[PDB]
Amino acid sequence: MTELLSREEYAAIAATLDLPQRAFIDGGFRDACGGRTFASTNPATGELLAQVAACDAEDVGHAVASARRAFEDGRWRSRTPAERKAALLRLAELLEEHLLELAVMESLDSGKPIRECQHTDLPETINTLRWHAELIDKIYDSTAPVGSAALAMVVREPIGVVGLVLPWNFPLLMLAWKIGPALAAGCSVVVKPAPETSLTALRVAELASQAGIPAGVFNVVPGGGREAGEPLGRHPDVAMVSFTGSTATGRLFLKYAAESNLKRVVLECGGKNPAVVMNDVEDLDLVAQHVVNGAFWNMGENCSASSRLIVHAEVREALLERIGAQLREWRMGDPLDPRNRLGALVSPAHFEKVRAYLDQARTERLAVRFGGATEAGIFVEPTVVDGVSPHSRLFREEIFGPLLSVTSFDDIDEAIALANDTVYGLAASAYTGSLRHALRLSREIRAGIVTVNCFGEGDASTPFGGYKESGFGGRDKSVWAHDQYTELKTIWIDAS
Amino acid sequence: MTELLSREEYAAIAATLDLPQRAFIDGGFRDACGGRTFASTNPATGELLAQVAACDAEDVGHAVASARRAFEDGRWRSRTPAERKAALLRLAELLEEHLLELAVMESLDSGKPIRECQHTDLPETINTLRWHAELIDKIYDSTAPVGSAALAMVVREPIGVVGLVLPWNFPLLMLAWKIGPALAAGCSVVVKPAPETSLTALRVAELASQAGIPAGVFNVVPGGGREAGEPLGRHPDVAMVSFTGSTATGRLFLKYAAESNLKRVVLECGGKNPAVVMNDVEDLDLVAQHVVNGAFWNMGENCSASSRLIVHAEVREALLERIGAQLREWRMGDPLDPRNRLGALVSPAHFEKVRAYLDQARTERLAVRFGGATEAGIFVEPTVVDGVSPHSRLFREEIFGPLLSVTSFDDIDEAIALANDTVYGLAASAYTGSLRHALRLSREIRAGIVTVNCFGEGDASTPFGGYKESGFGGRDKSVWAHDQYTELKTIWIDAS
Amino acid sequence: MTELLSREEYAAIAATLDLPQRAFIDGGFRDACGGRTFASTNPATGELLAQVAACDAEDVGHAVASARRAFEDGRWRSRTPAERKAALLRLAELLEEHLLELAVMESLDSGKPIRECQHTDLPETINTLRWHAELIDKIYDSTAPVGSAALAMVVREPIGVVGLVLPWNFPLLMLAWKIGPALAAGCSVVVKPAPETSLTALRVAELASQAGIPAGVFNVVPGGGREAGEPLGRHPDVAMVSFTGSTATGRLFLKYAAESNLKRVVLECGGKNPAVVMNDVEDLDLVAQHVVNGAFWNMGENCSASSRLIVHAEVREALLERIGAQLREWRMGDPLDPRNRLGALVSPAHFEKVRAYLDQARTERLAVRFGGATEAGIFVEPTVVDGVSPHSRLFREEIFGPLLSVTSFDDIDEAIALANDTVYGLAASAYTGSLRHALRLSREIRAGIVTVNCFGEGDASTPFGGYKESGFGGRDKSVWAHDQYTELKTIWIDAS
Amino acid sequence: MTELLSREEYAAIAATLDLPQRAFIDGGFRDACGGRTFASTNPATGELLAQVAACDAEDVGHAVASARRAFEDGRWRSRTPAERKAALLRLAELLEEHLLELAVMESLDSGKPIRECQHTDLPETINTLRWHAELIDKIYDSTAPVGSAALAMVVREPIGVVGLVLPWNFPLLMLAWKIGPALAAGCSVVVKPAPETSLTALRVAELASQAGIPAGVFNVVPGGGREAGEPLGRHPDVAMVSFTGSTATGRLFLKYAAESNLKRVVLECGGKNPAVVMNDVEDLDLVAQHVVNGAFWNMGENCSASSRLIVHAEVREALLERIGAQLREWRMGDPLDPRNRLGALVSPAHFEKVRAYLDQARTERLAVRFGGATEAGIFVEPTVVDGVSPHSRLFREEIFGPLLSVTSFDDIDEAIALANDTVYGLAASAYTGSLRHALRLSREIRAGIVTVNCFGEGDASTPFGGYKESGFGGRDKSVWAHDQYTELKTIWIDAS
Numbered sequence A, B, C, D: 001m002t003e004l005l006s007r008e009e010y011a012a013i014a015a016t017l018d019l020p021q022r023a024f025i026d027g028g029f030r031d032a033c034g035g036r037t038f039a040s041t042n043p044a045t046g047e048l049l050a051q052v053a054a055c056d057a058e059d060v061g062h063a064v065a066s067a068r069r070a071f072e073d074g075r076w077r078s079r080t081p082a083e084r085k086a087a088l089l090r091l092a093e094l095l096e097e098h099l100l101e102l103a104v105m106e107s108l109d110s111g112k113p114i115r116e117c118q119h120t121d122l123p124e125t126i127n128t129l130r131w132h133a134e135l136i137d138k139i140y141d142s143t144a145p146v147g148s149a150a151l152a153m154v155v156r157e158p159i160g161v162v163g164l165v166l167p168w169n170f171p172l173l174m175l176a177w178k179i180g181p182a183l184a185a186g187c188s189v190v191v192k193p194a195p196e197t198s199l200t201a202l203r204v205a206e207l208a209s210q211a212g213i214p215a216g217v218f219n220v221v222p223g224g225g226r227e228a229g230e231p232l233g234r235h236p237d238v239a240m241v242s243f244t245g246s247t248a249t250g251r252l253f254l255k256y257a258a259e260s261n262l263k264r265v266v267l268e269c270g271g272k273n274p275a276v277v278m279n280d281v282e283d284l285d286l287v288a289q290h291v292v293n294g295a296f297w298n299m300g301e302n303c304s305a306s307s308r309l310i311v312h313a314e315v316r317e318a319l320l321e322r323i324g325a326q327l328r329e330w331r332m333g334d335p336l337d338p339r340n341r342l343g344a345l346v347s348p349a350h351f352e353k354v355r356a357y358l359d360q361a362r363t364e365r366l367a368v369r370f371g372g373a374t375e376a377g378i379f380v381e382p383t384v385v386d387g388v389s390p391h392s393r394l395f396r397e398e399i400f401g402p403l404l405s406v407t408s409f410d411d412i413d414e415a416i417a418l419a420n421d422t423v424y425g426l427a428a429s430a431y432t433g434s435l436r437h438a439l440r441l442s443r444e445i446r447a448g449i450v451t452v453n454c455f456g457e458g459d460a461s462t463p464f465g466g467y468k469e470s471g472f473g474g475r476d477k478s479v480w481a482h483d484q485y486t487e488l489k490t491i492w493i494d495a496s
């Protein structure tokens, strides 16, 4: 754990930052063709941070063209895997050298607490880039068992220009989850970050040039959803799009592919993740520690967040007590105060969506056992709502904020049925002392990860992604992320 | 190599067949709810074969419901891999016992010649099922390198109810390419075959019941594209659709996914496959033999068909000469006549499309060097059209008939640029005596298979599928077909 | 489960058997060069069964020469994996057609009960051959991530002539465990079975010729250890030896390799396998069912047999009670009486070794809680000895008979220490209701398999083999058995 | 490519080195218990470098004991793969910072020329460690297809205390080839280096402590073959030995295993590697360039060295001519002189063996076409001996010096038979323009690597190791090196 600075010292670092403002295309910064900009404001203070280039289909066309040329060049693609690894490791170094700068910049643009930006987001981003850089020259393709008269290989090739559309809850980490495997594979990429959180991706693109990523191989095009993301998804020279965000918006990229060049689309979408607590747990306070973390890490702005606590009727009350006590340890406020584990939500509009589910809870006359408060029109208290039946809108809809629903069950067959009563299937957690119960819960819950007696998303080597409406066509992290950005080729050589 | 019968003998098998007519749903035959039928006719004669149930959204809803109930109660997927292998092997045994019956039925409904139905289609169908049956209890999933405090498995689970939408050109073989891996993975499957070629799929689904595939696990819903295919793609309980057919239609299934439950979609589509012949080949007669087979096997009704001959100027004429000689061994006519390697095209509508390209050749004043004639409104001669420039419509568009365009090059860089001059990328073949040239053609042609010094699609162990607009998201055959029908799950077990 | 016949009917099948008697070399039977024979007698009756060729280094030389020629030929090796699979599947069919004959013959030569020979040994043998036949055309080798200037494959090739030295406790199953992977890989093999149990291997070799295994590819050379096994291990043209038997004898094959041609040696040796029962098991009677089976299946003549019951002090007595009750279900006698789960030990000499540990228990004044009796100088009762400390010779030495030692423990750290207090490391079983305890026991016991809440050896797809002195250099079953019989080759093709 | 210094500058680094002298055991330096030493001298001058501790069975016992205690308490192996990777990367960083120091030290002790020590040995050593560090958290184990009633994992565990016995020809590189994979797998390692070349291993073990390799995990015990190597191979707590050296000595470690605890033994031994040159190569000068490098890199003190040139009669003379021309670029002399590609042989004893083969050439009245002279009792010229028949001693025996035999062939079947005319099978190279010939030479030469149209040993990702008497049981480099130091375990968890 790197040492945390003081509030004043972070403010001092903020004050000296030269925030990026222009798109990054073909090796350097440039304004949008139409010269428009949009406001990036610190959600916790209201202060304007920068006037960021507001790109449209014209800018996207230029960015894709510079990526297409670089791909056809071979300037990046033709380096050896060991060489591509070296350059991406250089990039990760530079991020590490600039860690405090990037951590403060991430916090300012997003509302995320500096404490977690420094200890989690930045180290996780640096480690994602290192892991995928190191992986590329460890990947073996195959030869097929075809006999002595032929030599058949089954190998992988970079798909081409790759569009990467990002959300705002983990700007840098999501950036690394995508560019890591995509760049290591030898693709050129065009990154359209969230307009709420565009600054750090722009800075990382500049650092990548310094590291020797050639011009045109890693471009960042900031702008709105319809204005910049749709032309990217529709572009006839983009070979593949990887998207993370809402299901509603991910569906559009399936249309964009269908109506353009049949580009491969991979979606990582939302979830309504359950946390199942059996009555045979060995340590209830440790469970409560994991449930609180799962529900409220990053203010609940987390695709893997625990949002449905599904708890055995005999331990519900004892668990709720220990959850309330754990919550006393979760300070919320000024994202640059290192004492805070909770910062501001990303934007007035997102704050309004979360707070609307506070209202919905009260409309449904549900018991708000903990939390329920708002501050400064941008902070929501960690909230726990008891007595939530599967028919509640709080049970069924992704809130993406610090709001935990609680549902009781009487036997494990009901817990599993409840856990699967969703159109989503991203993640799940299960808590039990029993081998029998643990095998049931981890095998029968239909989710892309099931953690047992802990909360989390795995590590750099385990794939992450959704069943059902939580994802489409792939997985982030692990060696399987490489599949997103490559085509399989059978080379069959007669030898008869 | 099984022994061919006489024309009269095949006619006698045909006269005794009890052709299936009804949807196969939940372990038995049934009529469409609305009582509608459509006329399946022998494309070589115009004679009615059967009035086949014309299923609609309601029948699709019943078929999916039975597939869903079978999936949920585990009657198939809870059997061990070894048990699922045994039942699939029973099925392939049954197809083998009914080989002649199935070959004649396949010919009658499709126009495909009995000779190839008996020696290629049925044995390849039987083998596809055996290989994928045999594969399932040889597949290992993973555990991830996460250290001593946790145990992390990365496993595959069956995705659920699977929709399988098939084309008319290889009815039985495409069926096996889909149900082989999908049933072996433990999915329930609802098959919507082409209306031109529905009889054999129905017969197989009946034999699968006999072999112990439980009720609801393998259903066949015959009917039209909009009437039965669309409701299947839109169905909220179908988890995945695998499609083989035109790019135009495959685009629709991406929209159906976007507009319903975000089901996984895998598309296998058309191609415009090149055949590159260098001036350093060791046996021009053998090249001619492979190029003729690649262009005119199955009357060019073949996704992998050689349709663009891209030949070095020094060998163009001497190749064409041996091609003509080879074409003298390719007899066309009555599909039940064992002497014919070429039968009838699938329908008057398709014959029209193919003939309009013969007219287009004349419109473009191109040299028709071989063939060019039609017979009886349903046969087309193997045709070779010389001097086709990349701007020609015959160079750019999928004809799906026995029509080979010929284009010259001077150097291998031009050959490669010509081979990739297409929105497609399904297959490619390349002939050369040079190690240097072989590696260069193998690596630089953007296709899912490149055969060197032969024509083909690989074997059971090699993946088949398109780059670019020839495919989306997957590969048929090989162990990679398994990925289409399964979800990855990380099971992360704390052990701290 | 195939239907069991009556005692009289098995006797009738025995009476009509034409027992093999000669070595099987280069496609057919032949006497030993020196014309000597040795007696094969039914251990349960004393009756002579056959005078079997008593081969020496001369016969071994001929067998290896016929295998060397076949390997150099390519007659087997050069068939495609799919073709080798077909022939080995034919062989498995023939065994199935002759199942009752082989089951009776196995029982007569070995003492093993006909009930288990019919229901277990023969089906397991047939399934081993089928699994490895099916596997061969599912195995992919690799290509290395070396960049664009070279094409590097990493492939596997058959090592050559392979010597297979077998024990007597599972003659057919061990035969299949070895020839399966070795033949599927394309090696020629020379099999030296145990002199106690040579008949069924000879019969299987004849059936393999009928199935189309070419002459010289699968030879069987019966004879003594020093007389026939040592020349095989020393032969300068044998490329690899796979051995199963005692550690003492396995050590010799390391010397034989060192003193001859450095052939690869793989050893599968004995064990002193623990069975750990925690005090938190959910069903004690079901544990007792698994412990009794583990200790006494095949009369304890089992490398994976449970021989050290390591049981928590609070459940020892309750477990011993349920073990005694389970034992009432285990009838021992006349191996052709289908009512018997226990048959005769393999030979007077082995009977004397087992009975010597009965004496040793009484010498050490240990409590013999169950069993302790002998019959007919060839049957030992299932025996349970209580109060066995780690210093006892019964704790430390492989008995290979129906004798279970019992040791108490007070906490799981002592159970694990006890479990690992051995020079062996073949197998282990652990029984617990706790996830925490199950993870500890399965990760910290140093054995090649740990089964949890059941007893066994895995299945056809899981590797089997020993840590420490229980094995050397490989694993039987699973895809990893293939490694035993192949060499890795890197083919590096410049392409610069 | 790092910048070479002047002869005087290297001499000045040499004059300042504080050479290690003591065994490295349990995290620090210590004397041998008996107080003995042996004289390590510069083979180019005769000057004493250091009196090095001369360890015996007692010191080996202490080193193993510290390695055992470290293994049992998990100080290294209980760290995560990612943590073990980080410390190994620290180590490789340290070697990089001391590159010049280590290169000069390597030259002094071995006679290897400083130029190759600086540009090949050290960078390859540094890279070996990085690759194997980077690999460990990319390795996935397996789960087996056993059905729904059980969960079966097939995992790898570290084998325990590992003995690593090294030769003198590539001291640092062989060290990395062994400790890279073995430390990454979590083993403790006891290294017994060659007495000629012990200094650099000692230095590295000290740097490994600095890098956070815990005490006892990486020990170095210098001393003689019988005195230190034998007790290591016989030690009852060493689980595995990996050996690289002569076949004669490697045979002894198989006996040591047999006569102690049945520890796993992996042997990498000598070779007699062929270089096959077809008459259809496109650039005879480039072939000559690869054949010269293959024969005379590291003065022919190279297990992969080209020692049998097997050349088509039509190109023999024109090849030899360009070989002579190439040899004019290979300067021999003072190992600290950066101009020299060839330094001193390792010892007067080895110089004697090499010279006796020069005398043997003259005895056999063979045409010495190039070289043939010696200087100063320790240098040997690059020598090419023409007209060597397969019956010659120079054709059959490992010389391990800069001596190339030349043999002609008329057809490729004879070339292949000549290449395989040996008890060895470590490496081979093959030059041809023909695709047909390349596949034929690639597949039919029985060696662990066949390079086509180049000379080499592959790269970090490809396995290196011998067929036949060149190896036993394993491969160095690549992911397969991991198998040497790990045990497979099936964890079968009932879930019925």
Ligand SMILES: NC(=O)C1=CN([C@@H]2O[C@H](COP(=O)(O)OP(=O)(O)OC[C@H]3O[C@@H](n4cnc5c(N)ncnc54)[C@H](O)[C@@H]3O)[C@@H](O)[C@H]2O)C=CC1
Pocket: D165, D166, D167, D168, D169, D192, D193, D194, D195, D223, D224, D225, D226, D228, D229, D230, D233, D244, D245, D246, D247, D248, D249, D250, D252, D268, D269, D270, D271, D302, D303, D350, D353, D398, D399, D400
């Ligand atoms: N292919 C290869 O990698 C190598 C092959 N060689 C060949 O082997 C020949 C002999 O050279 P050597 O220096 O004697 O190599 P070697 O095979 O005897 O030495 C290898 C290692 O084994 C150790 N050793 C030697 N005798 C031992 C014994 N009785 N017990 C245990 N360990 C023992 C040595 O101290 C050294 O560390 C060379 O002339 C050359 O032909 C030598 C070096 C490397």
Ligand SMILES: [K+]
Pocket: A040, A041, A042, A043, A108, A109, A110, A195, A196, A197
């Ligand atoms: K902002």
Ligand SMILES: [K+]
Pocket: A247, A248
């Ligand atoms: K939606």
Ligand SMILES: [K+]
Pocket: A239, A262, A263, A264, B467, B468, B469, B471, B472, B473
């Ligand atoms: K695509």
Ligand SMILES: [K+]
Pocket: B039, B040, B041, B042, B043, B109, B110, B195, B196, B197
């Ligand atoms: K029809």
Ligand SMILES: [K+]
Pocket: B247, B248
């Ligand atoms: K279209």
Ligand SMILES: [K+]
Pocket: A467, A468, A469, A471, A472, A473, B239, B262, B263, B264
């Ligand atoms: K989906």
Ligand SMILES: [K+]
Pocket: C040, C041, C042, C043, C108, C109, C110, C195, C196, C197
């Ligand atoms: K016997």
Ligand SMILES: [K+]
Pocket: C247, C248
């Ligand atoms: K022993």
Ligand SMILES: [K+]
Pocket: C239, C262, C263, C264, D467, D468, D469, D471, D472, D473
């Ligand atoms: K060997």
Ligand SMILES: [K+]
Pocket: D039, D040, D041, D042, D043, D109, D110, D195, D196, D197
């Ligand atoms: K020395």
Ligand SMILES: [K+]
Pocket: D247, D248
């Ligand atoms: K020797």
Ligand SMILES: [K+]
Pocket: C467, C468, C469, C471, C472, C473, D239, D262, D263, D264
């Ligand atoms: K061992």
